[PDB]
């Protein structure tokens, strides 16, 4: 029940904090416990009765943001360790699952139809564990995470799961102001995203539904100074997000967030000749009259 899940979480935090003081001989065995538990909760059925990934989210949320409300009576230095073990276990799970398309995208199908469900369970799980508590913990992770995800995405293009993780990492990088001076790691990750944005922009023209929404979400999560140099290439992605947003409301949300970021930070004269086609597709949202749509 609730208020017993808090007791289970204080138990797990006490075990990790107990063996985190035993040197680096057992500090290694925080990693494989977090890894084995993440594989365990990422092999449920895809969304007495069966639980899914949605129930372990408060567990892994209290694990990575509630050492402060626990250690301060237990008779940030553990939050950081558990965050690092979570990100290591995420990209360790990514570099081991079998995601290969078999001719049964006409009718391509997974060679490992159990590893694919585990990967997509991992994606929808990790979409709500990483965006909290990024203000220092993700900043040494940005380049390595994004580099590994781009190389896994280049050889698995039609995946709809690597663009979601890439949208997560670029949103977490924008939340901590990563691209400001553009540190050899910051410019390398910058130029990496500059090239990968154009690559995903060209390969999404063949995509249809959730591949298309995933690539659109990734492209409109990109920072302004990566878009500020190639605005005419990203503007049709904004028009397509404002058009697909009439039936998919998260895509209208990422389109409105993209446009409010562009109109504030991108310059006023490079943005000026593009409102003539950005703004007319907002007219579909202003079709409310409260008649039988009350």
């Amino acid at each position: 029940s609730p208020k017993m899940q808090l007791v289970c979480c204080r138990a797990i935090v006490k075990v990790f904090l107990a063996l985190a003081a035993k040197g680096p001989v057992l500090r290694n065995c925080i990693s494989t416990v977090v890894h084995q538990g993440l594989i365990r909760i990422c092999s449920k059925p895809v969304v007495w009765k069966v639980p899914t990934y949605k129930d372990y989210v408060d567990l892994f949320r209290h694990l990575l943001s509630s050492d402060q409300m626990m250690d301060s009576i237990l008779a940030e230095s553990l939050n950081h360790l558990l965050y690092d073990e979570f990100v290591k276990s995420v990209l360790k799970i990514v570099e081991k699952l079998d995601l290969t398309l078999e001719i049964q995208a006409a009718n391509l199908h997974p060679a490992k139809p159990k590893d694919f469900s585990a990967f997509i369970n991992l994606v929808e799980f990790c979409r709500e564990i990483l965006p909290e508590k990024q203000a220092e913990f993700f900043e040494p992770w940005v380049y390595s995470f994004s580099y590994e995800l781009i190389l896994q995405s280049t050889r698995l293009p039609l995946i709809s799961g690597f663009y979601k993780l890439l949208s997560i990492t670029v949103r977490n990088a924008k939340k901590i102001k990563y691209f400001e001076g553009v540190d050899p790691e910051k410019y390398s990750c910058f130029a990496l995203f500059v090239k990968f944005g154009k690559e995903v922009a060209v390969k999404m023209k063949q995509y249809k539904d959730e591949l298309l929404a995933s690539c659109l979400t990734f492209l409109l999560s990109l920072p302004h100074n990566i878009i500020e140099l190639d605005v005419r290439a990203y503007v049709p992605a904004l028009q397509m997000a404002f058009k697909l947003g009439l039936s998919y409301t998260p895509l209208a949300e990422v389109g409105l967030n993209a446009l409010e970021e562009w109109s504030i930070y991108i310059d006023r004269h490079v943005m000026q000749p593009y409102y003539k086609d950005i703004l007319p597709c907002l007219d579909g949202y202003l079709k409310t009259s409260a008649l039988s749509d009350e």
Binding site: A21, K22, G23, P24, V25, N28
Partner: peptide
């Protein structure tokens, strides 16, 4: 104070 031998930490890393 904890001890953890040098060769073991080197092999563990």
């Amino acid at each position: 104070v904890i001890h953890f031998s040098h060769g073991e930490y080197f092999y563990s890393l």
